[PDB]
């Protein structure tokens, strides 16, 4: 039987196949609303390295509804994909992208060395190296203020114990696995005492 025939399918394509992604410190969030989401396209794909879901089953929510779904996309390196998970610490989890301990959603990642590497080294993807405090869950800091590492205070000038807070990844195609770039999509689900707009094709 041909079907189902759905027109307002959720735009997971323009998130997963976006020609250009975003740096992890300025991670990009896509709000999913007023659409039917066929998550089978996600887990039936054979082009993902990691598909870790927390507190929710991706094979069991195509008959479920949610008030809103958020799609967060960014780029890190293979060593840091394990940090996109609840209860993790490190440069990415503390200063770039933090997930709550009761995180409900999936962390999808795949190698993007063919896309985000240049022979001269790709230096467009940045990550935050220092910050005066850890990030709260789903917090986004884009400030470029000079980090004061010592007693003396910097006047927006870079120098002794005064660091620019953003460092670039050195994505060259010859890097080993773990230093080549990985594109990451983080789907998060919320359910409030409000109408639901993101449902599966079943109901």
């Amino acid at each position, epitope marked *: 039987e041909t079907g189902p025939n759905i027109t307002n399918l959720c735009p997971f394509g323009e998130v997963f196949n976006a020609t250009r992604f975003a740096s992890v410190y300025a991670w990009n969030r896509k709000r999913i609303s007023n659409c039917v989401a066929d998550y*089978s396209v996600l*887990y*039936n794909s054979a082009s*993902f*390295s*990691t*598909f*870790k*879901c*927390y*507190g*929710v*089953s*991706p*094979t*069991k929510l195509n008959d479920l509804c949610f008030t809103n779904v958020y799609a967060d996309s960014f780029v890190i390196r293979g060593d840091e*994909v*394990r940090q996109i998970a609840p209860g993790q610490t490190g440069k990415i989890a503390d200063y770039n992208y933090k997930l*709550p301990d*009761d*995180f*409900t959603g*999936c962390v999808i990642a795949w190698n993007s060395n063919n896309l985000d590497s240049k022979v001269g080294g790709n230096y467009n993807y940045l990550y935050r190296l220092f910050r005066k405090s850890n990030l709260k869950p789903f917090e986004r800091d884009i400030s470029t203020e000079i980090y004061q590492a010592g007693s003396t205070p910097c006047n927006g000038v870079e120098g002794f114990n005064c660091y620019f807070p953003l460092q670039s990844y050195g994505f060259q195609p010859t890097n080993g696995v773990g230093y080549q770039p990985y594109r990451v999509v983080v789907l*998060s*689900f*919320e*359910l409030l005492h409000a109408p639901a707009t993101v449902c599966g094709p079943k109901k």
Partner: antibody
Amino acid sequence: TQMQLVQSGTEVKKPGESLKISCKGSGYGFITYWIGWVRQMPGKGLEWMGIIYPGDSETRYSPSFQGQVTISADKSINTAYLQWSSLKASDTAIYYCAGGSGISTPMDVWGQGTTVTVAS
Amino acid sequence: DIQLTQSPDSLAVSLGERATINCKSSQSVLYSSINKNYLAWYQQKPGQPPKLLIYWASTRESGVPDRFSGSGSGTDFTLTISSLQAEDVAVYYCQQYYSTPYTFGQGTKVEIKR
């Protein structure tokens, strides 16, 4: 069916020998599945041993089985493993592998169990 | 580390009557994002793997009769078999999947009273 877990055959081993039993997931979408191991001693309840995500081999153990067993996985063949290095007589039990797409999700698929006997 | 205690250990109920099993958790299992308790109920029979009956404290798994129902919130949960039948005689475990390590209840035996 979304996923079926086939388990290795019955094992009759001697005290001191090593053993490795398998649990192969048959179905699509296995990239999302986490496989756990449950021990059920003869006439006793269910004991959750550990769980592993084959995609990156993240492994969590129960404090009662930390260091006593080794839960590995081979993501290229959708197979998870549970192995001992030195079998005791107190290891005689049936071992179920249970799967579920995601972590902190219900174990909604089970194999028919592997019965291990450490005696003559 | 969450510990579960079931009660009673043994339960005898006549055919067609209501059987209720209680499960107490040493800690809450409530996810705030999706207001759901991460508590499951399993049934096991001799020579058979455990069968998932109820998850999210009160949601029925496929292939489960309508007479199985779960309830509760916080630390007290209840499995209710209304109109107890012959093939419902089994051992019932409550499992929490809030966080690892996963833990089971000690088990509740349910028999027919005649």
